[model samples]
Target: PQVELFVKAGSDGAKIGNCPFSQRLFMVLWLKGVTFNVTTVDTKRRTETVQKLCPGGELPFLLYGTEVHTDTNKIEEFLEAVLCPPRYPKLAALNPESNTAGLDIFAKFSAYIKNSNPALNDNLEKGLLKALKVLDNYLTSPLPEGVSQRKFLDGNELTLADCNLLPKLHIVQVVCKKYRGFTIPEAFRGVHRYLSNAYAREEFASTCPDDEEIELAYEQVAKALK
Candidate 1:
């Protein structure tokens, strides 16, 4: 494989979900069943030295010789451009419009995670729950006839929406439980069951690293902030 992935430091960084954006690209590749290798970098030192290799100094950047694709969204466009309409015409065409709501999921949840300082606790909970509730409603609404409803954001198959949202949601589940004093309410049975079933998939598990690493990442983040 010509693809090289820059992932978060420590642990078995074999799979994606190393950082949030890395996780998104990782899931996309898994869905594509492509071959690649992981190059783990110290989360702290990455921006310093890796900047030589990555002009923007970002993780989740792919290096194929001199060509570099930064972040998940850019990589997604590159991959689908090659894969769709030719190599794998049968694959589901990615639709950003369909998945636009999921982008908000990332924004709100990540904001909640960032507002970890004690002063922001109440705001964090309120903001994140508002985001989660929005997602729950999206899932809870009835599907058109003959929809699977078991997995994916839409259709009977995978799309960029699932590739983008599912990994972040997976991370949120762990971070919220370990850091935030809560679990997703059983009441939001729609997205609750949705994620539960997503976890069962081999693709998700093979790519997902342990909650401990994410917990460790939080520590690293806290220290850096200080």
Candidate 2:
């Protein structure tokens, strides 16, 4: 049976529309070897569904096995516990403590997103810079090194932490390269190296959209920043 996974694929999956949470969730599902059937949700239908179920009419809602999961974080945790138990052993070992720091990071990132006033370009730049600095610090910190001098946020094995962090890092890289005419802090060299390694994986590369769409997204964002 092909499990129905309603994903918002834009124009034949060319554009997923930069929903980081959705992207991460999809990646996690792919990693777990979950079989799912993807469906594109039109704008009107998306709003209707979220209006009935979610508070703010969000995308990326999951209808799986007699349950509708609205929140990505909750869905991710449930999957980790059930489908991919071994993937997050450290998190399981730590119990509640494992998520405390990660939650804090999420809060900070969310704050940046919420506070950014699109009308003021400088505000966006400053907010992004602050978030990028935090990420650079986390990536450069000497602990839980990844495979082969990888020095990832968590250890050698790719974990939820990396999954969570990468999307943000990608955003910074794309935005900075386009807007500020600069790259993210050199302190994130380890992270840059790690991302290079991550992209080398066929699974990760294949799952992500093509370079042209990605470049177009960045270009549009850059024009917005200007």
Candidate 3:
């Protein structure tokens, strides 16, 4: 296969980077059963080789055939279009708008993590919890008519939304608890169960970065905030 996925390397520049976007793309390909080479880039210290592959120095760039794709969502759409149904029938109807639930949670999580002002932390935490509550409700609530209950974000089968949100949730689980003493409320049973279901999947389990790696990547950000 001519498909090459260049993602950010870990703090050690060997393991997968602590990047949700990179992992999202990784899960997408893994779910599709595509055999592709992974090239880990030291994004903390972009070497000449890394720049040659991705001039703009973005993580999760894909070299598919003769073209290079840089955007995460665009790369996802391209891969699904080229490798679905007639190709793999992997995760059907991936572009469904209904699957777009919980899209803003990651940003809220980031805002909470990056807030340097202690005074503002309370509101930031509330914002993140609001997003999580929405997700928990979405998971427990009825789906559109015949769409059936969702075991993952989109349905029983993994879809683009699961690929996108699971990695971020992992980061939220680790970084928030470690640095700020924050935890996803135990009351959000649906969110907790959803995460458990995702963790059991081989595709998500394999592609997810280690908690230590995720902490290492965020430690710098936390320090800079100080």
Candidate 4:
């Protein structure tokens, strides 16, 4: 295949990795119905071939024909441009108006995860919840007079926002619950329902990493804490 994506592997470094960014790429490719080859690489077990191909040794880089792409944003742009419209008319554009929605959630989650002090952790947790509230409110917010309620982040269609957010939510759902004794509150019904809607999609279900893999991915960071 002309499109070969090299993504980080799971704890075994041979299965699909728990990197949400990597899975986001996978979801985009799947959503576009692009038949591509997937080459899983372990972070520490980087082969000379990949090291030479990907100078930075980062996973989820793409090899499209003779061109190489290292950045996720660039790769998404390339995929959307090259595969959409006249070239592949059947594939819908993944970009949506509310594309930037929920973009900062993962960073907030990271801050919460890395924090150690009790007082600081509470603030961090609140920050994370505040971010979630933004999403939940968006989900529950009123729409234009003629418009219908959204099934995904943007609409009934699965856009890039959903692709980007779902994996992060999955990580938050699993890792925070297991490692931090946290769960998304019952009050965020819209956010909870949004997750349920995303989970039902085949593209997301196929691309998502296992919960154990998600925990294993965060274990190193949690282990570093006292």
How accurate locally is residue 130 in candidate 1, as Cα lDDT from 0 to 100?
79
* TM-scores, all models, native as reference: 0.78, 0.66, 0.90, 0.90
TM-score of model 3 vs. true structure: 0.90
**Residue ranges of candidate 2 with Cα displaced over 4 Å:** 11-15, 45-56, 85-134, 144-148, 185-187, 211-226
Best by lDDT: 3
Each candidate's number of clashing pairs is 1, 1, 0, 0
Against the reference, the lDDT scores of all candidates come to: 0.66, 0.54, 0.82, 0.80
Error of 3 at 158 (Å): 0.4
In candidate 1, what residue range of length 10 has the lowest lDDT sum?
Answer: 217-226
**Clashing pairs in model 3?**
none
Tens digits of per-residue lDDT, candidate 3, 108-147, equal 9888888888778879889999999998988887665334
Give the distance in Å from residue 115's predicted Cα in candidate 3 to where it truly belongs. 1.9
- Model 3 residue runs over 4 Å out of place are 44-49, 90-97, 145-149, 223-226
lDDT over C-alpha atoms for residue 114 of model 1: 68
Where is model 4 poorest over a 10-residue stretch in terms of lDDT?
88-97
